[PDB]
Assembly symmetry: C7
Homo-oligomer: 256 residues x 7
């Protein structure tokens, strides 16, 4: 049984191969990380060399025990394929992960709308991103989904814009409405005066003349500025005699 | 018929091969489980070695009965392919399974929305997850579907937020409304006072002035806090003389 | 024409091959069925060995009539491929079939919603499942579709939950409403008293105060409990002086 | 030019091959049809042998005119591929065809809904099914589309169920309504008395109390039973003093 | 440079090959057309032989100038592939074309609905079908789209069916309505009397009793019959004292 | 280093190959263009010969520097594949381009609806088509999208058809309405009198009798004819005493 | 161990190969950039040569350490494939990037609608485009998505068109309305007089006669022209006695 020496040689090749593979791959992503590339891309690109070299080792090692070479390419091909399928979704998500962290279209702490759902971002991880809805629900979105959809970012821009739509009665003085609104926003300090300040008659409406006011503020102020300006419009308009109309209806009577 | 000895040798290779395969594979996911990896990932990765080694055995075993080698790679290729299709959906679900249990974006007992449907999670199994709708229906969702959709988790966060929208009549005192609402929530112990406590005039409405109240509570209290705070608003508002308006309409008569 | 003996040898191989194939395959799913596996899975896995062995037979048999071996792998490859396409949908449905019968996410006789359509399940067959809509329509759903969609099962859970929403007039006594409702459900024997019994003011509405009542019952009772508790609420509420309001409207007259 | 004899030999192979192919394939689906299988599956499976055998013939025939063998597998591969694409849709429809005729989820003459569209089935053909909409339009649906969508069959079940929803005024006698309705359906012979006979107060409505009546009849009667039972309810309810209410509205006047 | 004679031989093969290819192919779809098959399927199937034979020619011709054979299969493979992609949509449409003309699910001049859009068909061409919308727009729909969607054909059936829904006031005589409607349709000659003639109380409505009338006519008459029968109902109903009701409303006054 | 002469020979083959390739390809689409084919199809088909011939050159040229032949097919295969992906969308659009210009389902200057968006066509280019919305927005639609969607062409047809729907009061004289409408359209010269001229009572409506008028005009006139015929109907109807009704309502009073 | 000299030779080939590759590729996209092509397409096409040449190097280098050649094509094939998947989305986006910058269907600073979302474009980068919504949100859209969807460009056209729809009461003078509107737009300087100036009665409406006015202006003026022309219509119409009607209703009384 002197052809049962090849079995021992087969092992030798595998052990030496596993080690030689483990040490090249380590010694490759040592190189990559020392340049800059990216911790994950390194590990990934690296782990391909690793699994590649032990793929060669398996071919030659089995080959000394008469395993036909072109059957190993085939079996391993299938094996890899079966893995490939089972993972993929993952692989795709893993990649989106990188992109997101290395392009920061949103960063942790920004409020964003990731395709229908919107919340404050917490953390982007391997496959999935975590946000917290204004009200306290947690949403877990797959990195893959995120990257191939629009990213609406509420917070990256430092200055943003409220739009009020105020409806007043048809018999209201057009000039008076404009002046009161203009004088409200003129006096509000939180409204940026060097940017758009639109007060205008915008829509001849169903039962109301509709005025549009649009004014810019720092991103932080936007919410409070809206509320404060509104309370204001309501108060001033009342004290000044301008009516926010209820829904109207001309009824045309007929005794029958 | 001394070339009918290869038939006997063919069998020998298959039995030896089946055993040698069965004992390597066992002895591989013995190794994996002893590290940590994950019970399922082990069995899977393992069962690939297993079916791989008996794939080699079949090639060489048939090969001694003159089965052309490159016809075995082909036939088994097809066989595997036909299986592959039939399973897949499964494979994909099997993998989602792992991910879900080894990332716990939801854990058993959390209430979650898994793409349109929402219920309390019971158990994540091989291919499919089971939840119970608040009202007692059971839903079975495929692990695959779950993992590639958004996961909304109502329960992982410990503190959450009610939003009341209360509509009062236009001639109601703005300051009075704010004070009563503020004094209701101030006194409710279950409302977390160190967090958001927004009471504000939010919308000049169709037939009502609309106030928004937003207050935070422990996740457990959220439901009862809402109900209790509502009953309250209604009672106080009535006793204090503030009117929740019916839908309005100015009618403008015309005899014809 | 002594090279027209190979024609005879070709036949011999086919007949011996067909038989040798027929008896291995039979003798394999004898083994599988005797373990446990699953009648269908056996027949399938078995029928692959069968068609595999006669694939080898065809290669070697044609091969003795100078059919180049690597042209048989090719032709049969195509043949298989053309079948493969034509079937698939089937194969996919066949597999869903198995899964459904060997996981019983619904069993025959349960009422279920299988992605928009809902009915009482009759029987899960090879490719397609049959249900009967409450009203007597028959629906035939492909096993494949069913398995990759949500499965809502109304019947597997033994105890389920009605939710009433009752609207009463704004000037109705909050305490009185709660008491009558509570006293209706308290007295109904079919309502499980050891589970949720929510009677509460839920919504300040358009023209009605809306109370929510939620009470649990056995799955069988759920329908009759609802109807009986409703008739009741209506009767009691009338005799007790509580008004279910018609839609309201404040109209504000103007002679013109 | 003694190597221009191979040209003649090439032809010989083709003619003998075409005939040998035509006669085997005929002689195979003679076999299949005599078992049972199914006329179409026979012709199809058969026509694969046919085109397979002439594929071998083309390889060996061209091969004697120095056409490299592994170039014929390649060219014919492409040719087959180009056909394959162009057909497919057809192949898929052809297969659905079989399935539909050999499972009769609907048969000719049944009224069915095949994914949004519904009509009386006329005939299932090779690729496409023909139905006639109640009003006389003809619809042609592809067999493929049909088989991978839900099949709603109105006609296979012999007994079916009407549901009336009747709204009466709030001040109507609950007991009186139930009795009249019950006495209408009791007396209607076409209503199956040994099955469901639900008359019940179902919904406290907008401006009406809503009663639900559900009664079973033979499939043929269902339409006429509905109409006849309705005319009846209307007549009796009028003569008995029960009011079908118009839409209601409480208006709350304000001189301004 | 006696190995520069192969260059000359290479050309010879190409010219002979191009001709031998051109005259086989012509001589094949001479045969096909003489059977029956179909002009296009002929040209197509033919043009595959053509491009196939010049594929062989290119292999052997380049081969005598030392172009490695298995590099020609590869390059041409790619070339074909690149074409394949660029065309396809076309190929698919081309195939639908054939099917449509050789099954006439609609013929030129029939009015049809081809998945949302409907018009009178003008002409089915290579890739695309042209219809004219009743109002004069021209629509061009791809043959491919048409064939894989439902085909609604308004015109292939010779007799079709109008449905009138007439609403009358609740206090109208049920018997009187039926008689007038029945006497209108009885007298209209264009209504086929040997088919369905349904006049019936169909819906207890919001503010109207709704009668359904359904009557069959020749396809040509359908439009005029509807209009004429309607004018009629309106006239008769008025002269007979039956009221088509305006929308109703019970208003319940409250001085405040 | 006499085996460093092959390096020099490798270059020679590349230069000669690049030139031999460049001059065949030029000399091929010289031939194509001189027939008729189509400038782009020419350039395309041509540029495949070009890249093909330099593919052969690269194989043989590298081959003399011991680059294993079957590694060049592989590397170039991958290279081509990577390009293939990155382009495709383009290739697909490029092809649609051709089709659109060589079938003119719309030509520059026609108003068309290309799947939801509609505008006047400006120019069809390589990948994308440009139209101008009636109001001045520019839309750029990918050729690929266009060709696989419906093409609605408002302009190719020379005569088109307005449809008016006019609602009059129930107590209006049916005959009088028809006559006035008929006499308006009879007198309008721009209405084509040899085509459809439908004036008819079409719908018994909510609060109006609805007449439909449909009349054909040259495509140019259609817009102005509508406006002019409308102004007319309104004027005549008023002077003639026919009332366009406001929405109606029978109110049924109840003191409470 | 004189066969351990091949290890040293393997390295030599790799270093020489890496350098030879790095300097060809540099020296190719030196050439490309010097023509014109496009910085990105250069780098890409170049980087394929680069990775191609080191692919050859790896085959021959490993090959001198007995790595079977046809196993390197296989392993690297897999490696490449795994990368290919992980990237792709990127590759696709990278390509769209190019196209967008090298066709400028929108340029930085134009306001555009990129499939539902619309904003002012900031910058087109490698994979993703950045726009700023009128109100200050930032949106990040993938280049790939953009290119395969419609591109609506508000800004590339220099002159655009407002459409007013003004509703006046039925008893208003048709001629008077036209004249006032016409005289408003006639006098507005910012309205381009050499283009469309449509003032016309457009819709006989529910409770209003609806006039359409359409007038063209420079793209800059469009917004202000609208607002200014509206304020105007409202003022003039009031001073001239034309009434913008409230919603109408004929009510038909019934004492009960």
């Amino acid at each position: 049984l002197s052809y049962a020496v090849n079995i021992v040689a087969a092992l030798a090749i595998i052990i030496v191969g596993l080690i030689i593979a483990r040490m090249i791959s380590n010694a490759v992503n040592r190189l990559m990380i020392s340049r800059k590339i990216d911790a994950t891309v390194a590990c990934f690109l690296s782990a391909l060399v690793r699994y590649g070299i032990i793929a060669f080792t398996l071919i030659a090692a089995l080959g000394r025990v008469g395993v036909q070479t072109a059957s190993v390419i085939a079996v391993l091909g299938a094996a890899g394929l079966a893995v490939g399928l089972a993972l993929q979704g993952s692989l795709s998500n893993l990649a989106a992960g990188v992109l997101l962290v290395m392009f920061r279209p949103f960063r942790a702490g920004e409020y964003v709308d990731l395709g229908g759902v919107a919340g404050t971002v917490l953390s982007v991880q391997i496959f999935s991103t975590t946000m917290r809805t204004a009200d306290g629900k947690i949403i877990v979105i797959p990195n893959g989904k995120i990257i191939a959809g629009n990213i609406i970012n509420f917070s990256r821009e430092p200055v943003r814009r409220n739009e009020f739509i105020i409806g007043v009665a048809y018999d209201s003085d057009i000039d008076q409405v404009k002046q009161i609104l203009t004088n409200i926003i003129q006096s509000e300090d939180r409204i940026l005066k060097d940017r758009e300040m639109t007060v205008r008659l915008n829509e001849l409406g169903a039962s109301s003349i509709n005025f549009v006011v649009r004014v810019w503020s720092n991103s932080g102020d936007l919410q409070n500025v809206y509320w404060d300006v509104l309370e204001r419009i309501k108060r001033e308009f009342d004290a000044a005699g301008i009516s926010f109309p209820y829904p109207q209806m001309d009824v045309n009577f007929k005794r029958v």
